[PDB]
Amino acid sequence: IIFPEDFIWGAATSSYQIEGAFNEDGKGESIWDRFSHTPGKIENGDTGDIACDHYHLYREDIELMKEIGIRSYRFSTSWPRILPEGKGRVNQKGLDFYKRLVDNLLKANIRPMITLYHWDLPQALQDKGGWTNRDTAKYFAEYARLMFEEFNGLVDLWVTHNEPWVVAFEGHAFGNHAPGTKDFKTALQVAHHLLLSHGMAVDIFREEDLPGEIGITLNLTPAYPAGDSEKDVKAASLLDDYINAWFLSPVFKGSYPEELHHIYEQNLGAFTTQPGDMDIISRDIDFLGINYYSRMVVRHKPGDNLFNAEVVKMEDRPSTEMGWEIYPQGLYDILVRVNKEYTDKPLYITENGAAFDDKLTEEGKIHDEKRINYLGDHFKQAYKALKDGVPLRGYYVWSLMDNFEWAYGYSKRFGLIYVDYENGNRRFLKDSALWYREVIEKGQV
């Protein structure tokens, strides 16, 4: 298991999950500040108010990055830290933070990858409808241009959106994420606008002519039939379209998946689009980021939902603390499938990782063997994709450090680095960090 010497090994984080400084230096309120300050939304009543305090501690975190020896760092930039009202006047101190961060990364010889939108929409824009208001797509594109202007020649890897499926459905259909709406029609409308805003930002990226590459990051969950049944095969196919094709087909083919689009329209009425929208969404991009964690097993079950499809819990197979099945073969399957059916573009694993119950010892050690085993098994499947012709260029571990795990708060730890929040927010390299360091050095597992 040997990787190319120029293979981009990285680690990823997101702004709201690590930064803290939620109302400091002119930053505006985000929907996640609002959501986390609403009673009952987050486990244990945790908030992202302080989190890892990366906003103040970023210079120390870069030192740890160098220690591990990662070649690239994927992070997201907070829209309301930069534009408190989502539009209008720039908050120079918010922007100065990211300028300092980037200059530091480059001096450390770590390649930055910026995600423009990783879920922290300005609350000011939410009060005007958020992602159901087509104007939000335009403001996003103006924000994108601002960032392209400021980081021209400094950042050469760009992702417009992280996981539009999760933003749309978890945030607007099931209400588990900010803003917390529970309206499936709204979800579909939001998904369309996220896609539109993506294409709008790609157009601007070309126009600004800065060097580097732009893509989008999609969470992908391959679906597998629970039985030999042709009926299960079709049900599994449908849930697969629900998560994967719903976003992959517009971006790369310029259309939504037909059968699913029909099912939605007949049960819910049509969501609002304009002519030429599919052209914008499907602009040519430079790479696809894939976020992979697990798979779903599907049986046919008429009634009980719109797709007539039920997800089977695999209780007999290993799982992480999130309750997600461990299934490394899925990572291979999705890379191959993407390269076969959707695109010949370079692919990056922009997130993959696992939560396990981590224990900090007295000498400041964390023996997270299960995380090492999870990561090793997934690296091996990425190698196998690479060997078989997939143009995989890089792999980012989620996450560089323990952080605010959305609705679960701080109770779920995904980091290579343990964060001892209440003791000066001190950082400790887990054994998985030490293992990853050896992997990157030698390019082999």
Author numbering: 4 to 448
From the paper:
In this work, a BGL from the thermophilic and halophilic bacterium Halothermothrix orenii, HoBGLA, was characterized biochemically and structurally. It is an unspecific β-glucosidase with mixed activities for different substrates and prominent activity with various galactosidases such as lactose. The overall structure of the 451-residue large HoBGLA displays the typical (β/α)8 TIM-barrel fold adopted by retaining GH1 enzymes. In subsite −1 of the active site, the catalytic residues Glu354 (nucleophile) and Glu166 (acid/base catalyst) are situated near Glu408.
The 2.0 Å structure of the 2-deoxy-2-fluoroglucopyranosyl-HoBGLA intermediate was obtained by soaking crystals with only 2FGlc and not with an activated compound such as 2,4-dinitrophenyl 2-deoxy-2-fluoro-β-d-glucoside (DNP-2FGlc) or 2-deoxy-2-fluoro-β-d-glucosyl fluoride. Nonetheless, the catalytic nucleophile appears to be labeled by 2FGlc in both molecules of the asymmetric unit with covalent-bond (Glu354 Oε1–2FGlc C1) distances of 1.60 and 1.58 Å, respectively. It is likely that the covalent complex is a result of reverse hydrolysis. Based on the elongated bond distance compared with that expected for a stable covalent intermediate (about 1.35 to 1.45 Å), the structure may reflect a somewhat destabilized covalent complex. However, there are no obvious alternative orientations of either the 2FGlc molecule or the Glu354 side chain. It is also clear from the electron density that the equatorial O1 hydroxyl group for 2FGlc has been removed. The Glu408 Oε1 and Oε2 oxygen atoms participate in substrate binding by offering two hydrogen bonds to O4 in 2FGlc. Trp401 provide hydrophobic stacking with the glucosyl residue in this subsite and additional protein-sugar hydrogen bonds are formed by Gln20, Trp409, His121, Asn165, and Glu354. The puckering parameters [φ = 103.4°, θ = 7.0°, Q = 0.64] are consistent with a 4 C 1 chair with a slight distortion in the direction of a 2,5 B boat/5 S 1 skew boat. The attachment of an electronegative fluorine atom close to the reacting carbon atom serves to destabilize the oxocarbenium ion-like transition state and reduces the reaction rates in both the glycosylation and deglycosylation steps of the retaining reaction.
